[PDB]
RNA sequence: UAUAAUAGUAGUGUA
RNA sequence: AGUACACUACU
């Protein structure tokens, strides 16, 4: 409301001041940004009547005229005036020129972090770095806080070289590069892929890495779908040690042994977490007494079967598990429940990040990793310590076996499923850096949407609701689309098998226990749920805008400038790719198709035809056309090829005078040519195609 | 790094009561119109208990001198108009600004960073609660005791402090609130689709969170010095502090709120709840004086909530509002208007020095023909909150065509409860 | 939106199923949809997506925007083009609460702002507080009176200070040693004094 | 001369190199 | 798309003057949008446009 | 009614129409009317591949693979370096400059002209307008040649007569011979083709 | 009951004291420390660096 | 037709 | 240790 009238009394203000400039036969624009308190006002003003100095006088006074006429007052000391500079929100504009004050975030690479264990606070100071990032840092400063980040890390968890929880000396690794981000190694990937990705660079990076070294010489200048088909001729007999720990590590604590090749829908990176060493506190329970709904979960835990009524009703609907209720029945008993886990009750008592800090440091030497479930996430003790934990992995990932079937597992189940890792491998494979040149003026640009494609209409929290019941139609729901939505959930379902596994998994702890364990089967309708919630999940419509050498529109236009501005501190790159780098598919479907070689065509004869009628004489230009086509190649594709292509394709029209000098012009492109031009045109005689009407009177 | 081994390990107040006015007082020495002599009168207090505070005020003092000397040296890049987009603008990287930590020369972006950077080196939490109570309380209640005791005057036309001009008032919100209903017909819906106001006050984040809220009644056994302080206040009203879930369970548990369209609870809150309570305490921020924060109770912020939205949805209407705006977005509007900007300028001065251009090709000439200006008023706002007129809301509230006659009387009368808070 | 894509396909189906059994021959219907903001693909058929593995569309939907908004800044102020433009008319949904606050015009606060203000500006308030956008045959009828009545005020207040840029001189607030010293004399003995 | 003064040293120690490494007057007589 | 159809809409956007005509110039707008759609969809798809 | 419609374009029309225009990316296939394909940037002219082109003194396919030389702008040609024009040589017996340099367009190009804005904040604007006829590829090409090349001579009279001298030209002969019989390098190369 | 005690910062001897403590730091602060050397950021990061 | 979506905890930037 | 506007992490 403040900011509405605060927009008032600006819009007074333009008015007054457009008058006065009219009363001097001038130009004036004007144009306030207003938030809650902090304004700026930019006024240009082109008139030949009076000097500047009387304007900006009388700009002033009006200004702070119109702010006292709506209730409001400027701050005069803290507010100035600048020729070029706008501060908006803390975020400058120096002349059409964004520019930001990245240092903060650069400063908060030593931040304060949730305290859980050694991964997800490098993720969280990771994020700083990401952020800086954003705001126009170089790269070699964020890859300072990069560097700071796990450090600080290490320094926190006793993980610094030479100290006791050192892992380089427990695993087959040179260097802590070598190690997995999530068994306390450090992260090892191009900056754009840590920017773009968000930390599952580190996995993707060294596929990558993979592909390019053990991909046939023939097959190693094409997309990664075609190089990751490559795969089964690999022979897992030159796999170097280090290769093959990051591959167990992959296929069997990432991934699960019931995958096979021929999955053709899968689980998608952004299903599952990466933590693996958690440490485990032991923390005082906290008083927690003065919270009402605490005294009834406390009552209802003290009541004799009152915890498993809550816990039937949760199972019987489980679709408020993951998103929130829509009566007041559902609200309590997700309430109650959420008081059962341990994480939320000491997130209520007050926490300070100094105190959590000091015990993370305090308490690091001591057994706090369970092992139990590391070793359940392979087939089939107590609290185990960070180095008996580095032993026990490597003792347990010795006897497995890794085969040409496992790798193939491995890149169809982290590459394959998500377009955008696709999109990204290919970008990092078929890069091509032009010419360098210095950042002059630069612009935000918002990150776009990789996953184009889109099955799911309605919002994921009424398709989880939906799959809940079996009624497509509820409340807020169209009936068809709410069943064709559930027609591809269940299609996923049925494909991963994520049904069949919770059912197993659960009848096994049945079998084990010997008694219903219903929480654990809480838990894992959760995780389904927590993974058909991801798999629908729509559009995160994200904002995003990253400060860039110059403005990207579409998704190759920004993935170049983003490889360009983060490989070099000086200048920045133009980056043009081999094959189109996009893919279009599904977030959790296999993409075992490539894209044409169209757009190379496309590409290479609107150079062709641009650099001969550019730089070349009018006599020779056909000449040199036809010698082109006759020997030359682009982009390792004979031109000849792509001519055959652009002559036997249904796009002949934008390649009119190519087509035409070389004879092939048929007639047939003249009329599509025509047809796509034509409009109806006046003069009476209104002549269209094919259609002329004269009317006489 | 003989600056930086002293600001990295600064943890205390003497510096922060430096890093954060040198923004303003290095800025407004630099820019052309600037009150800085007000500023260092009345609010630059430094605080020097080290001998690296008395150096960097030293560097500071020196600082201002200079970018007063050197505001001249500011060019800028030659601008490429494509004439569908604009490449090479902003600042030229030139090094002949002064450095102001340590000597050497930076550039334009580099004095910015150097203005602008020490204020991230304080650390955050380095506040004493028993002094920025007492701190805060006084300045609330100053700001208070002045409005109570020199202002009595609501509408005038002369400009006076803490004042609104009337006519003016009710004719820009009238002109501002037909172009705003007239840009979207169906506003009502859209304020009540995203807002969930048809759905149960259980599906929005806000009434959900476990956020403070703050509760009202006899709540002596649990807080249980407190009974010294209950003895000897008789006029001691008790109050309790409660996650916001668990105050949204008690209301529901209690059958006070039900799972009934959320707006109508609300507007029947709006008369139900008649005295509003908050409560205040220290954020906690980095600056040298800490700011004061108010928790309501839930009521309260059921009926601003209301509010709150169905201002928001007329603020996304109106381009000159950016808290409407998606964050970090607002540097892309920023860039947008620079542009247009640049290119009113270049067109108009174009434009209207043609026959000049024409006629040269003479001083007599450059001088006559019409010269372009550009100006940039960045600016804060004194006390947004504090001295603020709120009457000016209720014309906001009955000037609106979106409000049935019932919903302008039950907001109003909210908004005249809230005057008594 | 789907909802035109969803109406066409309905009427699309409708049409050619009466003509698909005398030909024997299928016939598919294909609406692909793009959002223009978030540049997605909604293609309804699974068999035609069958048939195309892969869509690479990759273009921007920004020159459009671009022209609109200038069309729109051109033509915002026109009230007759923003009907022409305009979705349906304007409509309320269903009231709040089908009783108003009685109390509100006895309220204390409520009395010293109305004897704040002029007797005019009085009956203008207590009118609009009343007025019913649904039951009027306009809902502009009343800010629309509103501003025509304080339009002379408003329109005086404007050219007063239209006036006043000939009453300026050239001496603003510029800063320059001789204010600085000042002000670090006057901070020197307020700090020295506090 | 500027532009060239560089190009032609290092050509000049580089055939000095390269000629170690494989291991006026002439202008009149010419 | 093209660059002389941009300039032909902004000089028909600019010599407008009648609440008439912006909204044919705003609806011939969204077919041109729809046109550049369909065009570089079949283009992609590598069919008959 | 219904009549054949006459085809607004034909194939022989275009043909007799292109007699004057000798330009592979654009054609007239009505008598105003224009087709032409779409531009693309040059950087990509750095991915073909194939045998070099020999046209007079000039290896066309070393200037598909230049850098420097390929940039639109006027000025930027007539400024540039001999370095940058001595990877365009594969003279092998041309007696003349001219007669190699005829194998490069004569048609204008666009220079960038800067004026100024006469603002407070002075600055300048800088944009690309179709440059007159004098202002060709050729034309450029010429002047960084006489321009870069007198500096080269200038700067290789070893002999104190000039460049043409007997004296300077054995001194020549002595330096090509000994970097034939030493290994290449791209100095080496540079100073050959200088 | 007192004041915030507070060193003169526009006397001529306190900030001559400060400067000289500067100083003094960096007399000492700024010589080698005669071994190389080898941590954490450096060699795992001055490759990307 | 530039408009429908929103789990919990923690951190950061902003007003 | 609150309102709003976001972005990033973990389950
Ligand atoms: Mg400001
Ligand atoms: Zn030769």
Same mark, same amino acid.
């Given at each position: 409301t403040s900011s509405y009238v605060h927009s008032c009394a600006m819009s007074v203000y333009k008015e007054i001041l457009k008058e006065a400039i009219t009363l001097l036969d001038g130009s004036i624009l004007v144009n306030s940004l207003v938030h809650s308190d902090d304004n700026q006002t930019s006024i240009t003003i082109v008139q030949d009547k009076m000097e500047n100095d009387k304007i900006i006088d009388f700009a002033m006074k009006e200004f702070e005229r119109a702010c006292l006429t709506f209730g409001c007052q400027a701050n005069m000391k803290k507010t100035y005036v600048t020729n070029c500079i706008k501060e908006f929100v803390s975020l400058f504009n120096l002349y059409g020129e964004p520019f930001s004050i990245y240092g903060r975030f650069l400063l908060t690479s030593v931040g304060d972090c949730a305290y859980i264990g050694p991964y997800e606070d490098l993720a969280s100071r990771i994020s700083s770095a990401q952020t800086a990032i954003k705001h126009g840092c170089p790269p070699s400063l964020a890859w300072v806080s990069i560097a700071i980040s796990h450090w600080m890390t290490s320094l926190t968890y006793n993980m610094l070289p030479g100290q006791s929880n050192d892992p380089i000396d427990y695993?087959?690794?040179?260097?802590?590069?070598?190690?997995?981000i999530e068994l306390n190694g450090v992260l090892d990937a191009p900056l754009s892929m840590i920017s773009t990705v968000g930390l599952e660079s580190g996995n993707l990076y060294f596929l990558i890495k993979l592909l390019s070294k053990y991909t046939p010489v023939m097959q190693k200048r094409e997309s990664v779908v075609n190089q990751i088909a490559e795969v089964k001729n690999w022979k897992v007999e030159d796999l170097t040690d280090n290769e093959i720990f990051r591959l167990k590590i992959l296929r069997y604590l990432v991934l699960?042994?019931?995958?096979?090749?021929?999955?053709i829908m899968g689980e998608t990176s952004d299903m599952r977490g990466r933590s693996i060493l958690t440490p485990r506190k032991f923390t005082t329970a906290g008083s927690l007494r003065k919270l009402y709904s605490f005294s009834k979960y406390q009552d209802r835990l003290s009541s004799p079967g009152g915890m498993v009524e809550l816990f039937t009703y949760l199972l019987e609907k489980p679709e408020l598990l993951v998103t929130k209720g829509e009566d007041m029945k559902d609200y309590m008993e997700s309430v109650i429940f959420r008081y059962n886990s341990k994480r939320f009750k000491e997130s209520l008592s007050i926490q300070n990040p100094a105190q959590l800090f000091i015990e993370q440091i305090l308490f690091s030497h001591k057994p706090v990793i369970d092992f139990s479930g590391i070793r359940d996430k392979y087939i089939n003790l107590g609290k185990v310590t960070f180095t008996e934990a580095y032993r026990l992995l490597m003792r347990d990932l010795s006897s497995l076996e890794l085969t040409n079937d496992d790798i193939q597992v491995i890149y169809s189940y982290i590459i394959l499923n998500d377009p955008m890792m696709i999109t990204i491998a290919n970008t990092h494979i078929l890069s091509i850096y032009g010419s360098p040149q210095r950042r002059m003026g630069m612009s935000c640009s918002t990150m776009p949407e990789f996953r184009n494609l889109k099955l799911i209409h309605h919002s994921p929290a009424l398709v989880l609701r939906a799959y809940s019941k079996n009624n497509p139609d509820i409340q807020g729901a169209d009936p068809t689309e709410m069943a064709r939505d559930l027609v591809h959930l269940k299609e996923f379902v049925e494909n991963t098998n994520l049904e069949e596994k919770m059912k197993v998994r659960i009848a096994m702890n049945e079998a084990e226990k010997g008694q219903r364990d219903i929480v654990f089967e809480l838990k894992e309708m959760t995780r389904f749920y927590q993974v058909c919630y991801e798999y629908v999940?729509?559009?995160?419509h994200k904002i995003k805008v990253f400060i860039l050498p110059a403005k990207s529109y579409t998704t190759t236009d920004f993935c170049s400038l983003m490889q360009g501005n983060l490989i070099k501190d000086k200048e920045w790159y133009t980056v043009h790719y081999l094959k189109q780098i996009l893919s279009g598919g599904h977030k959790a479907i296999m993409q075992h198709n490539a894209t044409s070689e169209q757009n190379i065509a496309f590409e290479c004869f609107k150079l062709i035809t641009h650099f001969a009628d550019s730089f070349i004489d009018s006599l020779s230009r056909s000449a040199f056309l036809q010698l082109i086509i006759d020997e030359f190649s682009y982009k390792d594709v004979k031109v000849s090829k792509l001519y055959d292509i652009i002559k036997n394709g249904y796009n002949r029209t934008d390649f009119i005078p190519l087509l035409f000098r070389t004879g092939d012009l048929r007639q047939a492109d003249l009329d599509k040519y025509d047809a796509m031009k034509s409009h109806e045109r006046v003069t009476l005689t209104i002549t269209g195609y094919n259609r002329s009407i004269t009317i006489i009177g | 790094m003989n600056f930086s081994i002293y600001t990295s390990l600064s943890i205390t107040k003497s510096v922060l009561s430096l890093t954060e006015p040198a923004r303003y007082m290095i800025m407004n020495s630099l820019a052309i119109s600037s009150n800085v002599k007000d500023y260092i009168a009345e609010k630059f207090s430094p605080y020097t208990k080290t001998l690296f505070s008395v150096y960097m005020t030293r560097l500071i003092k020196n600082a201002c001198f200079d970018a007063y000397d050197q505001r001249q040296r500011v060019q800028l890049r030659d601008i490429y108009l494509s004439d569908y987009d604009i490449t090479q603008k902003g600042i030229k990287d030139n090094r002949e600004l002064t450095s102001i930590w340590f000597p050497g020369s930076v550039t334009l972006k580099e004095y910015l960073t150097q203005i602008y950077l020490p204020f991230y080196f304080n650390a955050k939490g380095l506040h004493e609660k028993h002094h920025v109570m007492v701190d805060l309380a006084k300045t609330i209640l100053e700001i208070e005791c002045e409005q109570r005791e020199n202002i009595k005057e609501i509408w005038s036309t002369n400009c006076t402090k803490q004042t609104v001009n009337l006519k003016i008032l009710i004719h820009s919100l009238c002109k501002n609130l037909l172009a705003d209903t007239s840009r979207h017909n169906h506003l009502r819906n859209r304020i009540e689709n995203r807002n969930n106001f048809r759905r149960s006050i259980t599906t929005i984040s806000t009434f959900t969170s476990s956020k403070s809220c703050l509760k009202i009644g006899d709540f002596r056994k649990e807080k249980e010095n407190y009974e010294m302080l209950r003895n000897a206040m008789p006029n001691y009203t008790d109050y309790i502090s409660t996650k916001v879930f668990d105050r949204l369970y008690e209301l529901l548990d209690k059958k006070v709120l039900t799972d009934k369209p959320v707006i109508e609870q609300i507007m029947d809150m709006m008369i139900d709840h008649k005295k509003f309570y908050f409560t205040f305490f220290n954020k906690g921020q980095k600056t040298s004086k800490d700011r004061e924060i108010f928790v309501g109770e839930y009521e309260a912020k059921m009926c601003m909530y209301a509010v709150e939205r169905i201002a928001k949805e007329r603020c996304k209407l109106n381009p000159d509002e950016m808290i409407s705006e998606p964050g970090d977005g607002k540097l892309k509007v920023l860039e947008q208007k620079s542009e247009q900007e640049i290119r009113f300028l270049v067109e108009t001065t174009r434009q209207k020095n043609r026959e000049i251009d024409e006629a040269i090709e003479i001083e007599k000439l450059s001088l006559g023909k019409a010269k372009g200006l550009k100006m940039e008023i960045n600016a804060d706002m004194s006390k947004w909150s504090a001295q603020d007129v709120f009457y000016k809301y209720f014309w906001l509230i009955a000037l609106d065509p979106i409000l049935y006659p019932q919903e302008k009387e039950r907001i109003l009368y909210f908004m005249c409860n809230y005057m008594d808070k | 939106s789907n909802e035109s894509s969803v109406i066409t396909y309905d009427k699309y189906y409708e049409l050619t199923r009466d003509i698909s059994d005398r030909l024997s021959i299928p016939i598919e219907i294909v609406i692909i949809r793009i959002d223009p903001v978030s540049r997605d693909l909604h293609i309804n058929s699974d068999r035609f997506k069958e048939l195309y593995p892969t869509i690479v569309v990759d273009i921007n939907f920004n020159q459009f925007f671009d022209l609109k908004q200038l069309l729109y800044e051109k033509f915002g102020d026109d009230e007759e083009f923003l009907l022409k433009v305009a979705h349906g008319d304007f409509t309320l949904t269903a009231p709040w609460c089908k009783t108003g606050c009685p109390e509100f015009w006895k309220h204390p606060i409520y009395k010293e702002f109305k004897m704040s203000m002029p007797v005019p500006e009085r009956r203008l308030f207590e009118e609009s507080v009343k007025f019913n956008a649904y039951e009027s045959?306009?809902?502009?009828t009343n800010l629309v009176k509103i501003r025509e009545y304080t339009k002379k005020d408003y329109s005086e207040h404007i050219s007063k200070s239209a006036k006043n840029i000939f009453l300026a001189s050239g001496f603003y607030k510029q800063p320059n040693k001789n204010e600085i010293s000042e002000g670090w004399t006057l901070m020197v003995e307020r700090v020295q004094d506090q | 001369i500027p532009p060239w003064n560089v190009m032609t040293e290092n050509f000049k120690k580089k055939c000095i190199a390269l000629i170690n490494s494989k291991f006026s007057e002439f202008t009149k007589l010419m | 798309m093209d660059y002389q159809e941009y300039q032909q809409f902004l000089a028909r956007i600019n010599t407008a003057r009648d609440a008439c005509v912006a909204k044919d110039i705003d609806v011939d707008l969204l077919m041109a949008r729809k046109d550049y759609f369909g065009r570089e969809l079949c283009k992609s798809l590598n069919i008959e446009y | 009614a219904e009549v054949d419609g006459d085809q607004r374009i034909l194939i022989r029309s275009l043909d007799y129409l292109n007699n004057d225009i000798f330009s592979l990316s654009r054609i007239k296939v009505g008598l105003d009317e224009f087709a032409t394909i779409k531009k693309a940037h040059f950087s990509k002219m750095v991915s073909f591949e194939g045998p070099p082109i020999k046209t007079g003194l000039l290896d066309l396919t070393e200037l598909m693979k230049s850098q420097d030389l390929l940039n639109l702008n006027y000025d930027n040609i007539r400024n540039s370096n001999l370095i940058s024009f001595?990877? *365009?040589?594969?003279?092998?017996?041309?007696?003349?400059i001219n007669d190699g340099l005829?194998? *490069?367009?004569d048609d204008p190009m666009n220079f960038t002209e800067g004026e100024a804005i006469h603002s407070t904040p002075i600055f300048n604007i800088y944009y690309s307008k179709r440059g007159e006829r004098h202002m060709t590829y050729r034309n450029a090409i010429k002047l960084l040649i006489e321009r870069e090349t007198k500096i080269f001579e200038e700067a290789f009279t070893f002999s104190e007569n000039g460049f043409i001298s007997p004296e300077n030209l054995g001194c020549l002969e002595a330096v090509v011979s000994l970097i034939k019989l030493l290994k290449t390098n791209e100095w080496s190369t540079v100073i050959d083709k200088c | 009951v007192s004041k915030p005690k507070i060193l003169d910062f526009d006397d001529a001897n306190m900030y001559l004291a400060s400067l000289t403590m500067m100083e003094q730091s960096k007399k000492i602060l700024s010589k080698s420390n005669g071994l190389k050397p080898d941590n954490f950021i450096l060699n795992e990061f001055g490759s990307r660096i």
């Open positions: 695993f087959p690794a040179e260097n802590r590069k070598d190690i997995p699960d042994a019931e995958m096979d090749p021929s999955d999940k729509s559009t995160e | - | 045959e306009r809902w502009n | - | - | 001595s990877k *365009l040589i594969c003279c092998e017996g041309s007696d003349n005829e194998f *490069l367009s | -």
